[PDB]
């Protein structure tokens, strides 16, 4: 049962690592996505306050 | 969804252009 | 069992001592810091009996012995008990004799000069290691993580010290010490207890309350509602069987002792915890630092092995750390073991063959040679 | 994408039109 | 791993170092001026770590460094890092070796003549180039523009320069050299946002400051109704989110640090603005010339990159100047990095071979040549 | 209780506060800038007890307090506790109610703007002060030393401002902020007195310390030959006699502390020390106004009393300093109450009656209106 709860343990916790990492990974691509999202919504908002005449 | 802003200045920039050319012309043409 | 002339490493604090040999990634031999002696008159004779006792010796014997730590709060106050527990580990456990093996000690940055001169002086005149260093606990925390960068929460038995450190320097005017530990945790709950009706107060009494401590207790996510719960419902306690016995049954107790970690006013104590000097060391580094930081805050010593502890501290950082940055801690298995594991790696590099003390160097200069050589 | 396309025909728009205002200008006031 | 001895060209400047081969139209890569060093005490061992950064390098780790900037308003004394600037230009950017090439450096027709001694000397001594040319800022300014006529309004991070020149030849007397710079607008903004309650002191707080300045600035065409809006509502504010995740708002102080441009005795300097400059460099020349320079104010440099900038001078020039005549400013895309631009024009022309100091004629005469051979 | 419907000065900052009336020569009621807070349960009844205690009582009884600073780095960050500072000053020390008595605050040059309104909004909102004014303490410093011209080094608690005077007239873009005050040095010594055994870190050690810093330390004119002797014998050592009969011995740390200023990079700062922000004060200033600044180095506020800090000063200038040229510096036994008694003289000044802002302007503008009518 120990084997098994340990099996469990481990393995959820190699699991649980690897869905953190996702998680890491996860929150840099979303970072990225809010980031460029940001960079091209303000850089548009930007870009036609600044260039209005034309 | 052109923003209103560059639509209607390029072309009116535009237009000061081509009526300027042609002014131009025509002045120059008068002169 | 070692085939080659390594260093030996040795972490010492107020709890317990890990040692073992340089280049493996656990320690050989793990005794607690404690000697102990008898406190009866003996009647029948011919039945051995010790003067005093050490570390496993100390505690399987400890039914008629007071036992006593030679460290408190990070620093050595007994040098005697010191060789003793050493002698016993590095001869009777370890099976080796320092005079041919250099030996890693270590402390954290702001721990009183006179445990980096006491370490180096025992090593040196009663060992006759022929070399030895004092490294940086923060520094053996960050190798057993994998990490450069990061800060040490070094939640320990004596103190915890907090000392953040940016690729492989030192950031020392942010560490903010902590008079708060796990020894201390120990008193809360052995006054809690008392509440109950279960008073423990002499030595075999304070044994047991550190061995609920450490096997009962959780730091508990959510601290209001957990004793919410816990404070209505049997369902949550949990029983412990004493050594005669007897069973004492522990509810919301059993997270209101580490909850001090995250209110030291429990034990009388001017400060917010664990969770609040975590940030305020952060606070107070470079404003190009906190990035990396607060990615990679590492929890390193003991009472780290609370399985509410992850979460918590991650919430609590969390709420008090900056939008946008990912703020993350590190709870890695090398918990409670980090700076043993620390040290063999740092005693094993080549990089560090240089930075050894010599028992010349040693010699011509006295025991504050420590102070000039090791950091 | 900043408006790369507005700041260029921008510049050849702001450009052109000035310059042919320039023209229609000296065009005449040349006399 | 080019396939032509194709002359290198770059601008080392108190800002940015740009740099690329002649004959293209571009710098191949543009980055800091920067050489960094460690403020902090190293505790772990086998670290790596330099005793300085370059670059991106300076930058990347910055968190613990403090950064230098080897150019002073337009001239080199730091000459040590700047060898290592360049290295890190040629061998780790553009992956050329000045020994296989002839190299092209620029400076202000007013920069003290050390500069030029002192970038010819490193250039032939310690990257054994071939051959070496300082030319003229203001010159290649007007190349990458398309004049021969007009006035240099190089208005970047070091000195605005404010020279004359007409039909390829300079107009001396008429240069207004003036000490107000992108450089002092980092600067300034730095107090002006200590005045809104974040201050900034430290070099990470001065690359902070630079970015917001580079990325929420502009100067506006009329200063004055800018700021009576922008004082009075949150509609012309816009917020900055720092490296640590702290968000800054930022009203008035968006345009009132780049209108010192205009308005100089915000920073205390004795100076009408650069548009007075402007003016008074065309004045004093001579009836015949006027006409043409009036109508070709050229911008070169940083902050002529602002909104409003181009037509807040050509408004002030205007005003300042008679009528009948034409005023205009000629600011094209290829702003702040056209003076690289006009590097890659001087360095190709078949007319500019024979002007470079060969490596014979240097060390026959040593660096001192450079004042007789360029210009 | 006062004859005269004078104004009163008060010089309130981080450290302590320096309160009297306006046209006499010394502050009548000398507060810390403290409110203090109960940390314990009760268990006696009828005890009175407050829920907060200020200024003389806030340290008296303190042994169960913990002590907060409204006033951090030169700002207030707790206005209500300034309040209860004020009320106490005004009404039970002074003996006056601000209605009748206009009041003169203090703040540096730079200063966040948020500071001086929030200052103005409380003295008119909720003690109904008749009329304001916030001076800037350069001013108040030069008044009392019998100049127009100088240097003012306000080296206090918070920050140390480094901001010339020239004629009377600010010279603002020479003012060299520096993060680097009195309350720093404290920090300093807790965690090198913790290297020597003696651990400080709640509220009674904290102000311990600072006790310990006030009589003991200082900064002589040669660190590092005051250290050889400080670190290898206990004839440069010093003992303090903690509360409760215990004491402390200090040796270099008595040195080590002040010597930040100097040394900065003591507590993680990046800076050359109150010596080069003195220098650039003077030399970012024109050349026929160097020579004038030279001649009137001014110390005022705190840490102007280190011993050795006067000529410490005017070593460390004159070493960066052009030859020939005189540098003198200025001060007088009246250190550090030299800004209360400008502050008598200017709110005294019936040059400077109009200068005040009345209850009405205040009403029709708002506080905002400081910072149009002080300066
Ligand atoms: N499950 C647990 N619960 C509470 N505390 C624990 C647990 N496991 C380990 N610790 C604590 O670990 C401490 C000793 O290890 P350590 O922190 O590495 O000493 P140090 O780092 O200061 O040299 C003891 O206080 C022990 O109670
Ligand atoms: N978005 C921007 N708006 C205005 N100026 C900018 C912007 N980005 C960069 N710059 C400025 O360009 C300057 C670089 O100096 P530079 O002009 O290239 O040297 P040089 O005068 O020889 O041409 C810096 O002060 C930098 O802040
Ligand atoms: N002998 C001394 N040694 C060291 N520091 C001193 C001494 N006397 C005064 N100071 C420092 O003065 C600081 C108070 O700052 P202060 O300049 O008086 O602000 P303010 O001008 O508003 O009153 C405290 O940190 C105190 O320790």
């Known amino acids: ?54 | 969804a052109s923003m209103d802003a560059i639509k209607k200045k390029m072309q009116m920039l535009k237009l000061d252009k081509e009526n300027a050319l042609d002014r131009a012309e025509q002045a120059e043409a008068d002169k | 069992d070692e085939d080659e002339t390594t260093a030996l490493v040795c972490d010492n604090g107020s709890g317990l001592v890990k040692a073992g040999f340089a280049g493996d990634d656990a320690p050989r031999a793990v005794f607690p810091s404690i000697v102990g002696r008898p406190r009866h008159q003996g009647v029948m004779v011919g039945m051995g009996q010790k003067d005093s006792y050490v570390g496993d010796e100390a505690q399987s014997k400890r039914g008629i012995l007071t036992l006593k730590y030679p460290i408190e709060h990070g620093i050595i106050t007994n040098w005697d008990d010191m060789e003793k527990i050493w002698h016993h580990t590095f001869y009777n456990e370890l099976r080796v004799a320092p005079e041919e093996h250099p030996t890693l000690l270590t402390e954290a940055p702001l721990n009183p000069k006179a445990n980096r001169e006491k370490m180096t002086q025992i090593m040196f005149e009663t060992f006759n290691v022929p070399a030895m260093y004092v490294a940086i606990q923060a520094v053996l925390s960050l190798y057993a993580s994998g990490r450069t960068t990061g800060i040490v929460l070094d939640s320990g038995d004596g103190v915890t010290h907090n000392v953040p450190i940016y690729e492989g320097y030192a950031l020392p005017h942010a560490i903010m010490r902590l008079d708060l530990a796990g020894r201390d945790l120990t008193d809360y709950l052995m006054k809690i207890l008392t509440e109950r009706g279960y008073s423990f107060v002499t030595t075999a009494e304070r044994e047991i309350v550190r061995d609920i401590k450490e096997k009962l207790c959780y730091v508990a996510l959510d601290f209001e509602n957990e004793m919410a719960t816990a404070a209505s419902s049997s369902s949550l306690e949990k029983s412990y069987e004493l050594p005669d016995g007897q069973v004492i049954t522990i509810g919301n107790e059993r997270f209101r002792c580490p909850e001090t970690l995250f209110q030291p006013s429990f034990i009388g104590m001017e400060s917010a915890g664990i969770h609040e000097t975590t940030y305020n060391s952060i606070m107070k580094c470079d404003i190009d630092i906190r990035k990396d930081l607060y990615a990679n805050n590492v929890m390193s010593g003991g009472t780290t092995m609370y399985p509410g502890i992850a979460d918590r501290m991650q919430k609590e950082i969390t709420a008090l750390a900056p939008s946008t940055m990912k703020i993350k801690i590190i709870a890695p298995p090398e918990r409670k073991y980090s700076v043993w594991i620390g040290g063999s790696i740092l005693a094993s590099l080549s990089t560090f063959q240089q930075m050894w003390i010599t028992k010349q160097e040693y010699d011509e200069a006295g025991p504050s040679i420590v102070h000039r050589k090791c950091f």
């Open chain 1, 1 to 54: 049962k120990l084997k098994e709860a340990e099996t469990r343990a481990e393995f959820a916790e190699r699991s649980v690592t690897k869905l953190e990492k996702s998680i890491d990974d996860l929150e840099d691509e979303l970072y990225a996505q809010k980031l460029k999202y940001k960079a091209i919504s303000e850089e548009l908002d930007h870009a036609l306050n600044d260039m209005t005449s034309i």
